Structures are given as C-alpha cells and as structure tokens.
Enzyme design. Structure first.
Site, short mmCIF file in Angstrom:
data_model
loop_
_atom_site.label_atom_id
_atom_site.label_comp_id
_atom_site.label_asym_id
_atom_site.label_seq_id
_atom_site.Cartn_x
_atom_site.Cartn_y
_atom_site.Cartn_z
N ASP A 158 0.83 -1.21 0.00
CA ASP A 158 0.00 0.00 0.00
C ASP A 158 0.85 1.25 0.00
O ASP A 158 0.55 2.23 0.68
CB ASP A 158 -0.98 0.02 1.17
CG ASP A 158 -2.20 0.96 0.89
OD1 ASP A 158 -2.49 1.28 -0.30
OD2 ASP A 158 -2.87 1.33 1.85
N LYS A 160 1.98 4.73 -1.07
CA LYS A 160 1.45 5.95 -1.67
C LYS A 160 1.81 7.09 -0.75
O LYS A 160 2.11 6.85 0.43
CB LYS A 160 -0.07 5.84 -1.88
CG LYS A 160 -0.85 5.45 -0.64
CD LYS A 160 -2.36 5.30 -0.96
CE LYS A 160 -3.12 4.80 0.27
NZ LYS A 160 -4.56 4.56 -0.05
N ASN A 163 0.36 7.38 2.85
CA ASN A 163 0.85 6.49 3.91
C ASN A 163 2.29 6.77 4.34
O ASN A 163 2.89 5.94 5.01
CB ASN A 163 0.75 5.02 3.46
CG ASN A 163 -0.67 4.52 3.45
OD1 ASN A 163 -1.53 5.09 4.12
ND2 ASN A 163 -0.93 3.42 2.73
N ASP A 176 1.15 2.38 7.99
CA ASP A 176 -0.08 1.58 7.83
C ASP A 176 0.25 0.19 7.25
O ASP A 176 0.54 0.07 6.07
CB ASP A 176 -1.02 2.35 6.90
CG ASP A 176 -2.42 1.79 6.86
OD1 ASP A 176 -3.36 2.59 6.64
OD2 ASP A 176 -2.59 0.55 7.02
N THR A 193 -4.31 0.47 -3.78
CA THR A 193 -4.96 1.68 -4.26
C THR A 193 -4.85 1.74 -5.78
O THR A 193 -3.75 1.50 -6.30
CB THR A 193 -4.28 2.89 -3.61
OG1 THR A 193 -4.37 2.78 -2.17
CG2 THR A 193 -4.96 4.18 -4.06
#
Ligand SMILES: CN(C)Cc1ccc(F)c(-c2ccc3c(C#N)c(N)[nH]c3c2)c1
Lengths: 342, 18
Positions: A158, A160, A163, A176, A193
């Site tokens: 994840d 991005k 985060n 996260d 995402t």
C-alpha cells in the site's frame, strides 16, 4: 564482499529479532485512562487516529482506535490482527514504532509514535512537485525499507504518499500495515490503491514482492511530476492504462530518472528492477542514485531537503480537522473470541 | 496539459484503497 557481507549480516540479525517477536507478540501494555485525548488526526471505515497525551509522562502519541464490531462487520479481523503483529515485531528507522497496545469491551488500541509533520501527500499537493534531489531522498528511504521488509518475507502492498509521514528531522515514517502480508512465494488478493496497483494484481495473477517495486516507480513518478503516471475518472479506466505498457514522462524528467522508471514501471516481471537476479542492487546501483550515500541515509546523517514546521509537542497543524466524536466503551464485551490474540 | 487532465480526473484528493 565488505559492504556486501555487512548487509547480509545485518539482515540475518534483523530476521532473528523479527521472528522472536513474531512468535511471541507483546500484549496489553497500557490502558485507556493512561491517556488524555487531544484531537482527531484521521478517520476510517472502522476507526480513527487521535493525538493523545500520556498522563504520567506528558509524551504525545498517535492512538489508532478500532471499533471491534465495525472490524467484524467489514471482514477485517485478520487484517487488524496481522497489522498489530507486524508492527510490534519490526524495527527499522523508517517504520513507525508501536509504543503500546491494549483492548477493551468495545475497541482495539494501537499507540504509536506521533509524527508531527503530517503525510507526504499534503506537502506534495501543496508544493506541487518535488525536485529530483528531494524525490530521490525519499525514494532512497523506501528502497531501504523494502529491502528490510522483503528480507522478512513481508510484502507491503500500500505504498502511496498518503501512507508516508514526515518526521521532525524530515525523514519518512511508514505507518499503515493493514494490507501487508508475510509471503514467501506468491499471493492472490486484489488489494491496494488503484493508481499504485501493479499490472499483475489487476490481471488477477499470482504475484510476489515485485508489486512493491512497481509501486515505488509510481511513487517516484508522482513525487517528481506532481501527478501519478496512470490516472482517470474511474478506476477501471486507470487499470486499462496500467496494463498497457505505455507511460509518458514530463519533459523536465532527467534521462536517468526516465530510465529508472522504465525499469520499475515494467509490465514484464522477468524484466522489472528489484525482481532480477541482483535484486535490490539493480536499483541501488542505478545512475539516478549515483549520488546517494545509502549508509548515510540509513543512519539519518543526510541533511533533509525539507523540514516541516513544528510549533512544539502536540502541534497538529499538519493534519486535517475532523469532527470530534465520543469514545464510548460498552458495558458488554464485544467480539471477545475474535480478538483474543490482540 | 497532463496536469489539467489530472485535475479533471477528480482524483486529486486522498485516495482510498480498493
Ligand atoms: C485512517 C486514517 C486516515 C487518515 C489519517 F491521516 C490517518 C493517520 C494519521 C496520523 C497517523 C500517525 C501519526 N502520527 C500514525 N502513526 N498513523 C496515522 C494515521 C489514519
């Protein structure tokens, strides 16, 4: 080698420490009335994050509060248990630290280091785009963090700007782990995402840690351009663009940056950097990283290109404002069996 | 421009996971 054999030894020590904590996780290291609530920092489907002050010490922390009933409703039990297990077991300069965890009749609580500079996302949208040296500083931190996580057989899944938190010294903290998985071989879950999904996830293949190196390519592109390489009004149109092996670069990207990105945004797994026989060293040795002192980044001895504005401890100016809601604790224990191991 | 196209996408804010 010399430097080479140092890395091998470091990662073997790291795996031994990780496995000991993985096999015997810490539990129940504080309680709710040890903290004063200060402000909501973010909210989600099944919880929220609050700035809290430890009453005894005055130290501030970010406390993630998960509603057990909502976690069950949303089918997030395993992901929640797994995130806490990972966080209490890892140890790396660019990973947020878990300070305490506990649960009560209604909620699960993860008390983490407070990272006052806020999300990279906000700084990027505010500034527009980062110059290549600035983007490279952050990218180097992610490369090292993935080398560490992948050596533990953890896929992150994840990455991005949303985060990545920026600490007081300007360095990244990854926070996260809700989609991270311990995976020696392949895995199959459609998760992440849209803008950051590797093609093999979209195409419903089995995939491996190479998806993190694709996502690094997306991150570097968005940091240096100000927008991601694949976007559209609807995710389905984003996926069609991703699985095309087509990308366009802003005219201000350097030749070295374009060459690195062609090799990370590589639809062909057999060709993608990070997934070849020399592994992460194909990335570390790339011309775009020629000026990067990898050990100095790890030791946090490099002057950061951007230092967030911090008006003290408990300053929350780098987070958004949210409606403050009560923290109700039910008289009835909810979902006890499901969360025994938390 | 590509930037204008990004604004028109409507996906300039914080992105949720799938
Ligand atoms: C969910 C959700 C949404 C938006 C957010 F901004 C957040 C968030 C905000 C701050 C922190 C933090 C610190 N400091 C930490 N260790 N984890 C966070 C998550 C969560």
């Amino acid at each position: 080698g010399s430097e080479q054999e140092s890395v091998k030894e470091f990662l073997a020590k790291a795996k031994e420490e990780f496995l000991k904590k993985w096999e015997s996780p810490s539990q129940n290291t504080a309680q709710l009335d040890h903290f004063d609530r200060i402000k909501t920092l973010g909210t989600g489907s099944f919880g929220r994050v609050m700035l809290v002050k430890h009453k005894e010490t005055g130290n501030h922390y970010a406390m993630k509060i998960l509603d057990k009933q909502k976690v069950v409703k949303l089918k997030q039990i395993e992901h929640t248990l797994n995130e806490k297990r990972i966080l209490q077991a890892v140890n790396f300069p660019f990973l947020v630290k878990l300070e305490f965890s506990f649960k009560d009749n209604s909620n699960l609580y993860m008390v983490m280091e407070y990272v006052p500079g806020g999300e990279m996302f906000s700084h990027l949208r505010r500034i527009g785009r980062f110059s290549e040296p600035h983007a490279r500083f952050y990218a180097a931190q992610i490369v090292l963090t993935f080398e560490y996580l992948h050596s533990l057989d953890l896929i992150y899944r994840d990455l991005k700007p949303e985060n990545l938190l920026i600490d007081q010294q300007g360095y990244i903290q990854v926070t996260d782990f809700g989609f991270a998985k311990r995976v020696k071989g392949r895995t199959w879950t459609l998760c992440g995402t849209p803008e950051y999904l590797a093609p093999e996830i979209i195409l419903s293949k089995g995939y491996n840690k190479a998806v993190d190196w694709w996502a690094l390519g997306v991150l570097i592109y968005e940091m240096a351009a100000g927008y991601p390489p694949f976007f559209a009004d609807q995710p389905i149109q984003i996926y069609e663009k991703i699985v095309s092996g087509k990308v366009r670069f802003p005219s201000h990207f350097s030749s070295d940056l374009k060459d690195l990105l062609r090799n990370l945004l590589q639809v062909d797994l057999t060709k993608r950097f990070g997934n070849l026989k020399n592994g992460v060293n194909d990335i570390k040795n790339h011309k775009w990283f020629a000026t990067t002192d990898w050990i100095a980044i790890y030791q946090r001895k490099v002057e950061a290109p951007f230092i967030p504005k911090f008006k003290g401890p408990g300053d929350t100016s780098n987070f958004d404002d949210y409606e403050e809601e009560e923290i109700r604790v039910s008289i009835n224990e909810k979902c006890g069996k499901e969360f025994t191991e938390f | 421009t590509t930037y204008a196209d990004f604004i028109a996408s409507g996906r300039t804010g914080r992105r949720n996971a799938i």
